[PDB]
Amino acid sequence: ADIVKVAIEWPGAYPKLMEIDQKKPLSAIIKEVCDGWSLANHEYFALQHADSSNFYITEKNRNEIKNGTILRLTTSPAQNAQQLHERIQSSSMDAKLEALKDLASLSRDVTFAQEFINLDGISLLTQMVESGTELDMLSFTLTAFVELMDHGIVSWDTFSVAFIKKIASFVNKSAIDISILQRSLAILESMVLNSHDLYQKVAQEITIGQLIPHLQGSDQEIQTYTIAVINALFLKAPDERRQEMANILAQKQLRSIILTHVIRAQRAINNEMAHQLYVLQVLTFNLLEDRMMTKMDPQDQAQRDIIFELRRIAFDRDYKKLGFINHVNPAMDFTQTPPGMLALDNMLYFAKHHQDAYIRIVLENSSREDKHECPFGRSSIELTKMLCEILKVGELPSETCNDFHPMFFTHDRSFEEFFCICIQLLNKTWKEMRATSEDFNKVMQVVKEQVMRALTTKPSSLDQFKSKLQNLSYTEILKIRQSERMNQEDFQSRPILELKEKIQPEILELIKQQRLNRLVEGTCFRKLNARRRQDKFWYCRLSPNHKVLHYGDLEESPQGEVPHDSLQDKLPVADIKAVVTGKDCPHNKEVLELAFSILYDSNCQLNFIAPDKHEYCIWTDGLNALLGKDMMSDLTRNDLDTLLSMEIKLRLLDLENIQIPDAPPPIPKEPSNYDFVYDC
């Protein structure tokens, strides 16, 4: 279709109508136009949309050619450029002002960004910034500047460390408008992301004391900003430096602020922000992996002072009762990270935190010679490390997740709370198991399960999490799972099995109907590299035809829905070829498991992100149905069989409490009496 039909504008006319030969060039038919329009130097005139923000149409944007509207011909983009390189580059508040609002818009332009690099837009801005007499329209300035630096073509150094100090003032100024100082921040943290020196002197441009009130501002956005900022703050430092860093940090009762304006933010937290928080958490955590990484020198004494006086508090070979792995020197076990020194720290923590309950435990099992004393050094390091990994401390997330644990904010060392709670439930369920030293691991394992399933609670409070300790079941859980298993086994009995297979297809069908509903409702989608206020999130709906998806756009937000229609709206469905998952979204890692690329006409396709494995299966399988394909996540089969179960229960009812014929009695010969017996 190397043609496109169009109605066409000009100041002072009616629409020239071009079924542009697309095989005819941009500029060839451009001159066709402009000299069918007397626009001398036809090439001095570029084409955007006549309509909204109207970005020019290049190979890609002319790949972004469409039909059904009218377009904006105007000066060349570099022509436009030098024009503003007059207007904004003039102190003509009219010219600078209007053209500047314009340029702020344009700078979504990355082409003219290249062009304007070449008009040295940045020198212009650095000027208009460092230079405007107590400078609004400069909101446009930064706006542009932003989308430019965004375009990332940008090097960054030209923002001079001195001009950067100008920044440190702009921010150090009366906190500039949400727009203003916010974007300031944004680019700041960016330049941070670029290089060492940048980050360094950024610190040498900032204080936390600065940073603090701004987050104490209520704006979810402003917070989110300086939040991710401080995230980066810890991202780059030297631990040495970064120690003193964290030190002052929490030393601002920091978590209190967290609590009040964020945790106690009823006005919820940008899943953006909240994600940064996910992160922040991770960081705060890994800070300490160091000690989790720090092993031991058993031959040393000072540690032995530590451990003896602890035992002594716990009391006041000589360690045999103390049920380590080793009673001559369990210190070797802590020349092993995980946890190394970490577990010793923890025991000290439960102690000074709960010397009462602490020594209570100490003598609890170190006393019983049944099969239910506890392997103390063993259990200790066990819990320690198992946590760590269940946490995966020392790790680097991605922008992956927007979720967290406020319980770990319900104390600064809210871990050590978790630690001791774990030891509580630990001996507790140990005895719910009345376990013995071997099973321990599995115990731990199930313990992990426990906590996992306890963290399946997505709890909020360590003490709500003790309410969760309550909510626990010792073994009703394995009951639920393997019970579904064994009932499936029973129903597999032959005569029981018979109609199972037969109906199970349309059982699945029912599934598929609901799937139909689902795909019609349509869901959000987190895009890729669509951070920084692009609809990374983007939702969906669908025509009951099922045949043109009517998809949409969203954002990673605090509160609720935001179904704002996008060009991510409409697409004929059955044309679609298929969908892949994971790797073939081809570019953390865990999101691969939620990555899946819907591919259709040859490359017209998209990589894709589900909001959950639920939604993964949801789309995957509903799609399967759309492609007449079978559904996969045997969660779906779980359903099927649940459905199955009671359904055929109905059929057990047909002969309730009547013996199961496994060996089916045959069909005796049909009596030839078609002289029937009784009429009917």
Does the N-terminal peptide bond of residue 339 adopt cis geometry, omega within 30 degrees of 0? Answer: yes
Calculate Rg over the CA atoms of the chain: 34
Task: Let me know: does 372 contact 336? Beta carbons within 8 Å.
Answer: no
- Token pair in block for residue 536: 């990374």
Task: Say if residues 8 and 15 touch (Cβ distance below 8 Å).
Answer: yes
Identify the DSSP state of 631. P
Ordered alpha helix ranges (H), 287-406: 289-293, 302-313, 341-365, 376-391
How many CB atoms neighbour CB 664 within 10 A?
Answer: 9
DSSP β-bridge partners for residue 598: 579, 606
> Token match 């086994």: residue?
489
Q: What is the rounded distance in angstroms from the CA atom of residue 325 to the CA atom of residue 484?
A: 39
Rounded distance between C-alpha atoms, residue 584 and residue 597, angstroms: 6
CB 615 within 8 A of CB 596: no
Query: How many residues can be counted in the chain?
Result: 680
Q: Determine the residue type at 415.
A: F
DSSP characters for 14-78? --EE--EETTS-HHHHHHHHHTTTT-SSGGGEEEEESSSS-----TTTTTT--SSS-EEEEE-HH
SS3 category, 492: coil
Give residue 489's Cα distance to chain centre.
39
CA–CA separation, 519 and 573 (whole Å)? 11
Do 23 and 34 contact (CB within 8 A), yes or no?
Answer: no
Query: Is residue 404 within 8 Å of residue 231, measured between CB atoms?
Result: no
What distance in Å separates the CA atoms of residue 349 and residue 383, rounded to the nearest whole number?
14
- Closest among 478, 489, 526, 519 to 619, alpha carbons compared: 519
Distance, CA of 36 to CA of 29 (rounded, Å): 10
Q: State the Cα–Cα distance between residues 415 and 413, nearest whole angstrom.
A: 5
Classify domain 496-635 by CATH number.
2.30.29.30
| C-beta of residue 366 within 8 angstroms of C-beta of residue 319 | no
Determination method here?
A: cryo-EM
Q: What is the C-alpha separation between 340 and 379, in angstroms, rounded?
A: 14
The per-residue b/e assignment along 359-378, b for 16 or more CB within 10 angstroms, e otherwise, is bebbeebbeeeeebbbbbbb
Report helix, strand or coil for 564: strand
Crossing angle between the packed helical segments 376-391 and 440-455, to the nearest 10 degrees: 40
What resolution, expressed in A, was reported for this entry? 5.5
DSSP structural state of residue 595 = B
CB 408 within 8 A of CB 393: no
Sign of the C-alpha dihedral computed for residues 171, 177, 182 and 188 taken in this order = negative
The 3-class secondary structure across 151-214, one letter per residue, is: HCCCCCCCCCHHHHHHHHHHHHCCCCCHHHHHHHHHHHHHHHHHCHHHHHHHHCCCCHHHHHHH
DSSP code, position 549: E
Q: By the 8 A CB rule, do 74 and 45 touch?
A: yes
Residue extents of the structural domains in the chain: 3-73, 76-132, 155-269, 292-474, 496-635
How many helices, marked H, and strands, marked E, lie in the chain? 25, 12
As a CATH number, domain 3-73 is 3.10.20.90
